Design an enzyme around this catalytic site. Structure first.
Site: not given
Ligand code: SHH
Ligand code: K
Ligand code: ZN
Ligand code: K
Length: 397
Positions: A149, A312, A178, A268, A176, A141
């Protein structure tokens, strides 16, 4: 040969952020617990001869004022005193706030992923490694003068820039959850770097791009038709995501004939990620969508860069990335990498409880996107004077 980016200092720096905590240590210690390290060549992170050389490398994409603001943010966060009103304004002007806050090692942490991904690109260039993995990288990002992000420095753009500047065409695949906006934007006007992101997109979901625009944008100027996107609805399982992506990947490879492939493998999409959007697994007999995509990409025998990204649920990200690592060794070397379904004993064994198993704990719109993408691929090939068998590509879908 398969390379992996690792180092004592590298591990300390990749483990220094508030958002990702010790995730990198879990990934690397699980790979090590599974006896994969002797099968991999350690790729040391790149270090520079001087501050001027480092700045020259980072500013190949980022602006000097943004790099300067990021280094000042680290310095300010290493002091007891709160930020002045003027410094708050300066940071906000680079989006160095919110999901991209400062912390004592923000610059060292961000730079470390760039050091790792640039060294990984060099190992591919000198033909030392056929594939290089960097689980400390994949920060898709980050923009020229903007953090986004939790991505402060775009290690992917910088690694691709090193690869292109090595007739050279790079295929970027972003797995990903995202949209890979930062990478897509950096190469929006370049036909030599073809970007492909598969992701979730819905109203109010981050970052908001990689979908119908209010039209489907796909690059500009000489880069028209060079940015590919597949937005998917929530709840997609391993099989449907594999069938949605599979023909696109093979089609990109046949038409583009890339010199290098760069894969962002954000974890994710896993059914167990707290985002809880897609239902992908790390299962290796349904077959993990991630393992299916990586296996396909590796069958092309093109020098490949495999990077991390989102993820995460730290032990589940480690479980997936350990399986990607073992599959990479198998595909490249032709050597079977038998992994016990039980987590082996090690430092972080306790984090895999209460069952301590390797498998994660989980039990038409696409056709219209396929037709649109095939048409974009034909348009890209015609604009770029590339020779391809239309029937061979149409038959894939
Ligand atoms: O994953 C990302 C970033 C996404 C936006 C940033 C927020 C990330 C975040 O804190 N996610 C999260 C963590 C724990 C529980 C729920 C959501 N890009 O690939
Ligand atoms: K992607
Ligand atoms: Zn992501
Ligand atoms: K492009």
């Amino acid at each position: 040969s398969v390379g992996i980016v690792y180092g004592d200092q590298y591990r300390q720096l990749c483990c220094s952020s508030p958002k990702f905590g010790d995730r990198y240590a879990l990934v690397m210690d699980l790979i090590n617990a599974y006896k994969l390290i002797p099968e991999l060549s350690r790729v040391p992170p790149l270090q520079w001869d001087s501050p001027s050389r480092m700045y020259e490398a980072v500013t190949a994409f980022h602006s000097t004022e943004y790099v300067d603001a990021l280094k000042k943010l680290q310095m300010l966060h290493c002091e007891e005193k709160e930020l002045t009103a003027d410094d708050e304004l300066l940071m906000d002007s680079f989006s160095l706030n919110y999901d991209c806050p400062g912390f004592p090692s923000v610059f060292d942490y961000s730079l470390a992923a760039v050091q790792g991904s640039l060294a990984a690109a060099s190992a591919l260039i000198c033909r030392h490694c056929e594939v290089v993995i960097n689980w400390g990288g994949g920060w898709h990002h980050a923009k020229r003068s903007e953090a986004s992000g939790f991505c402060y420095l775009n290690d992917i753009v910088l690694a691709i820039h090193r690869l292109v500047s090595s007739q050279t065409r790079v295929l970027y695949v972003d797995l990903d959850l995202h949209h890979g906006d930062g990478v897509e934007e950096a190469f929006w006007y370049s036909p030599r770097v073809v970007t492909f992101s598969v992701h979730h997109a819905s109203p109010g979901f981050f970052p908001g791009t990689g979908t119908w625009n209010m039209i489907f944008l796909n690059g500009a100027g000489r880069g028209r038709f060079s940015a590919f996107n597949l937005p998917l609805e929530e709840g997609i399982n391993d099989l449907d995501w594999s069938n949605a992506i599979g023909p696109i990947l093979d089609s990109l490879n046949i038409v583009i004939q890339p010199s290098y492939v760069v894969v962002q493998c954000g974890a994710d999409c896993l059914a167990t990620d707290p985002h809880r959007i897609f239902r992908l697994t790390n299962f290796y007999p349904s077959l993990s969508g991630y393992l299916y995509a990586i296996k396909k990409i590796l069958s092309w025998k093109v020098p490949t860069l495999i990077l991390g990204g989102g993820g995460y649920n730290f032990p589940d990200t480690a479980r997936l990335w350990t399986r990607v690592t073992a599959l990479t060794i198998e595909e490249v070397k032709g050597k079977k990498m038998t992994i016990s379904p039980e987590i082996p004993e090690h430092s972080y064994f306790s984090r895999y409880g209460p069952d301590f198993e390797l498998d994660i704990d989980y039990f038409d719109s696409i056709q219209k996107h396929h037709r649109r993408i095939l048409e974009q691929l034909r348009n890209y090939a015609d604009l770029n004077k590339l020779i391809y068998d239309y029937d061979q590509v149409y038959q894939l879908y």
